[PDB]
RNA sequence: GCAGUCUGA
DNA sequence: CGCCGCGTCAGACTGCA
DNA sequence: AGTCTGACGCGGCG
């Protein structure tokens, strides 16, 4: 149902919790990197320009 | 429409079947979002004929790619049309030209 | 808050050792009844563990000494 | 011919106008190519990708 | 490709840019002079740097 | 030196029904562009206006449909009603009614007249009826708001039920369509450093140019209170 | 199962004989039903909406 | 309502120094971060009143490049040290301070001849260095009240100084995304301010907002 | 589950 | 002359026992 | 098993 308390829960569940981001082909080691999630409202994963 | 095009838009739109092109010149007798009734000219109707072309437009059907194909009447009431004139724009056609 | 573990890596001079020491301490904090030695700043037990590592408060030797001491003192509680 | 058509519509024939920042309200230091490009929306919707 | 162009544009110099030759107390005065519009981003200038 | 000249709303020039030029004068050197861009952003983003948010046509169940005798789809009728420029006095919501028959264009002049609802462009074509027996009859709920609220977000208001046949229109409430401004050197009795700001507004006709400047400056001056006190 | 055997005997109703296999809108898609076509096998009773 | 706007609820001030602060305001309406930030930035930079050194006449120096013996800087750097001299004058718009100092070592701002209404905010501000133990420097410094920044290239054997009248020396801001009950489009305005000492940072922010809100008073609806 | 086709990076 | 290999991830649509 | 078959690669390797 996505009640409004679920989002306050979720903002804690992903507070210091890294996620791995991977773009295939993983030609080398840096093809998988772990970032901390900032919850955004779109449907597109936002990816720092330097990586 | 494209403000900048190449002139091959009117052929790409007409030669596919998305548009409803007039088979015989005449005068638009009736026009509705789903129908165009053209009254054929006097020198174009065969002897022994009502002399009226009815183009039933396709409204909101599912494409193969789940997009929408939808024919809107381009002509308005009382307007005269020639043979081969676009009567109803298809999907991605603006007033007869292909507009993607 | 933790953005780089470079400080905690000189204290435990290996990166593959930092992970194991920090995970042992973070599990002590998460399912053990143990409390952090640094002020819990709305962090996760992993980040609290690393913040304890980088301040010299925790390493594998300190964890082993403390576990030994608690094991002996709980073995002492037998009447 | 492109520049002649621009000059017919009173636009600058160089193709670039000076623009201002919407946020800070001040002028971009160099003239910026502004014009009408025919943009398409491909069937690679992010609703279908997420 | 956008950061290198930004920093390339920032760091370059032009010979008669607005506010050339003046003497600045430091980087903060340079930023104040730029945002005020009193000097160009390329004004060849003398700034006391620490 | 510590004293600043304060701008007064010197002149308003209504070039057209939808276009106007308001002059703020005199401004000290530098406040021209400050006020210009502050007012430009506040006007262009936060003006209150009325917009059509619900249509109810009698024989129609959904947008992806056609009415017999109406040349447009129902979806094009809705896209035409989205641009209905209307102003309402003393209400935050009103349900206009449209009834038309016979061959000809159905325009905003054919909406049932209410005294406190002024349709500022009666020539706005809503649809065309192409049959002498065709007839269109709709209810048009215009609403006061701010900014742009799409219908897919207003399905959030899950009150008791929405009927089948109540077509939701995206709501773009803001009346201002373009804001330019120019800081020109205009003088007082004897001073040369004073400037004059000319704000060039283009609206849909449902806001008064002076009222828009007053509303924008009020938004700004009540947003600056958090900075004036700074507790 | 035994614990669920106690549970539905506590709150006083066991499950029915039929399973919910109804058609449902996929997650994320939200639209308007613009057409319904019902095809029944020849020899099958047509329901009211058919 | 259509006229009710989000006003800043969280205003966090972090004084990094006596003259440097970060003021975080949250939340603003979408796009109001840049409106308030840029209006305040422009006012703090170029329209804020204050008093600073405009001219200086050194006894033996005729133009900006003629060096002076005994002082370890060229005149081009004594002027650069005078430009940063934070000074307050209460009852006048123009004062002529006098700096007389002979001997050895630094000549700080504390060695300026005292006038009762002129305060020096940083008396440890070094102006020059005397090196010969018979080196004497005697200069007249014209403090003048104004507003904004007025470079010397515009005001054209006295020596001109860029007159940094404004107490602000660095005003920056950035607008990041705040959130209230699952609206993410709201704004959060972080202002980063440094003044020269004549005015604490939050007082400068308040005086700038007072200037803007006093300009607007002819249009507001009370 | 598989095969074919097309497409994306 | 026969045998072994010939990038990764992904979405869609058919037809098939 | 009869095809009103498919083939229609390449480069090492043993």
Swiss-Prot record, chain A:
Domain of life: Bacteria
Cystine connections: none
Family stated for the protein in its record: Belongs to the RNA polymerase beta' chain family.
Subunit structure: The RNAP catalytic core consists of 2 alpha, 1 beta, 1 beta' and 1 omega subunit. When a sigma factor is associated with the core the holoenzyme is formed, which can initiate transcription.
Entry function: DNA-dependent RNA polymerase catalyzes the transcription of DNA into RNA using the four ribonucleoside triphosphates as substrates.
Protein name: DNA-directed RNA polymerase subunit beta'
Residues represented out of the complete protein: 403 to 453 of 1407
Curated annotation (Swiss-Prot), chain B:
Transmembrane segments: none
Top-rank taxon: Bacteria
Function statement: DNA-dependent RNA polymerase catalyzes the transcription of DNA into RNA using the four ribonucleoside triphosphates as substrates.
Quaternary organization: The RNAP catalytic core consists of 2 alpha, 1 beta, 1 beta' and 1 omega subunit. When a sigma factor is associated with the core the holoenzyme is formed, which can initiate transcription.
Family the entry assigns: Belongs to the RNA polymerase beta chain family.
Listed name of the protein: DNA-directed RNA polymerase subunit beta
Gene that specifies this protein: rpoB
Full-protein positions shown: 697 to 796 of 1342
From Swiss-Prot, chain C:
Full protein name: DNA-directed RNA polymerase subunit omega
Family, similarity comment: Belongs to the RNA polymerase subunit omega family.
Role played: Promotes RNA polymerase assembly. Latches the N- and C-terminal regions of the beta' subunit thereby facilitating its interaction with the beta and alpha subunits.
SUPFAM superfamilies: RPB6/omega subunit-like
EC number annotated for this UniProt entry: 2.7.7.6
Keyword Transmembrane helix attributed: no
Example of a GO MF term: DNA binding
Originating species: Escherichia coli O45:K1 (strain S88 / ExPEC)
Keywords: DNA-directed RNA polymerase, Nucleotidyltransferase, Transcription, Transferase
Curated annotation (Swiss-Prot), chain F:
Swiss-Prot/TrEMBL catalytic activity: RNA(n) + a ribonucleoside 5'-triphosphate = RNA(n+1) + diphosphate
GO biological process, one term: DNA-templated transcription
EC number(s) stated in the UniProt entry for this protein: 2.7.7.6
Gene Ontology molecular functions: DNA binding; DNA-directed RNA polymerase activity; protein dimerization activity
Start and end residues of each stretch annotated as Alpha N-terminal domain (alpha-NTD): 1-231
Gene Ontology cellular component list: cytoplasm; DNA-directed RNA polymerase complex
Source species, domain of life: Bacteria
Top-level EC class as recorded in UniProt: transferase
Keywords of the record: DNA-directed RNA polymerase, Nucleotidyltransferase, Transcription, Transferase
Domain notes: The N-terminal domain is essential for RNAP assembly and basal transcription, whereas the C-terminal domain is involved in interaction with transcriptional regulators and with upstream promoter elements.
Family as reported in the entry's similarity comment: Belongs to the RNA polymerase alpha chain family.
Assembly mode: Homodimer. The RNAP catalytic core consists of 2 alpha, 1 beta, 1 beta' and 1 omega subunit. When a sigma factor is associated with the core the holoenzyme is formed, which can initiate transcription.
Function, in words: DNA-dependent RNA polymerase catalyzes the transcription of DNA into RNA using the four ribonucleoside triphosphates as substrates.
Name of the protein this chain belongs to: DNA-directed RNA polymerase subunit alpha
